[PDB]
Amino acid sequence: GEWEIIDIGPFTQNLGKFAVDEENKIGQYGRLTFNKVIRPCMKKTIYEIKGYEYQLYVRASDKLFRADISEDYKTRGRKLLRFNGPVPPP
Amino acid sequence: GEWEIIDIGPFTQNLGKFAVDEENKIGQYGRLTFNKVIRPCMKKTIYEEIKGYEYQLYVRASDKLFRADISEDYKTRGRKLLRFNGPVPPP
């Protein structure tokens, strides 16, 4: 499935917010406050198109994390696949 | 420095060979046998003129997947294995 690099405008920032909101619900890390998504952000398209996956570098509570998020083309449902950190700056 | 996705041709495969050979020198894993670098491969171009590059790789070695970050200084050709961690899940 093709890969590409996407910019870090408000669409992508909302993806980072989704990651932190979802992580906060799970409660593995405890309370994170979302700051910003930083570059690079990668998007995988799975084929029409079945859906997508986003790999993000998310700044939350003054630290950096990796989150992976999937999106279904047909239903538009989103899910936080993975979230770990802190990781060193790219 | 800007990021981009690069090919997985011989230049890139040789980066994965470098990674596995360097990792094998530390010997924290049992002996790893390089299989292939898989997509996606990312490159960051570092400016002071381009001073150098950093590469984030997904390397198949001994039928598992490893993430390896590599730097290289253009002038000296200094290639350095910054990290190697694994196994990780398929991208």
Determine the fraction of residues in helical runs of chain A and give it as a percent range: 10-25%
Over all CA atoms, what is the radius of gyration of chain A?
Answer: 13 Å
> What is the CATH C level class of chain A, in words?
Alpha Beta
Cα end-to-end separation of chain A: 24 Å
Q: How many domain units of chain A?
A: 1
Assigned CATH architecture of chain A? Roll
Note the quaternary state here: homodimer
Largest sheet of chain A, in brief, is: 5 strands, antiparallel
> Strand percentage of chain A, roughly?
over 45%
Structure description:
- The structure is a homodimer.
- Chain A is 19% helix and 49% strand.
- With 90 residues, chain A is of the alpha+beta class.
- Chain A has one domain: Nuclear Transport Factor 2, Chain: A, CATH 3.10.450.10.
- In chain A, strands 1-2-3-4-5 form a five-stranded antiparallel sheet.
- Chain A is globular.
- The interface between A and B is small, with 9 and 9 residues.
- The PDB classes it as plant protein.
- The entry lists the keywords plant protein, sweet protein, sweetener.
- The assembly is dimeric.
- Crystal structure of a single chain monellin mutant (Y65R) pH 8.3.
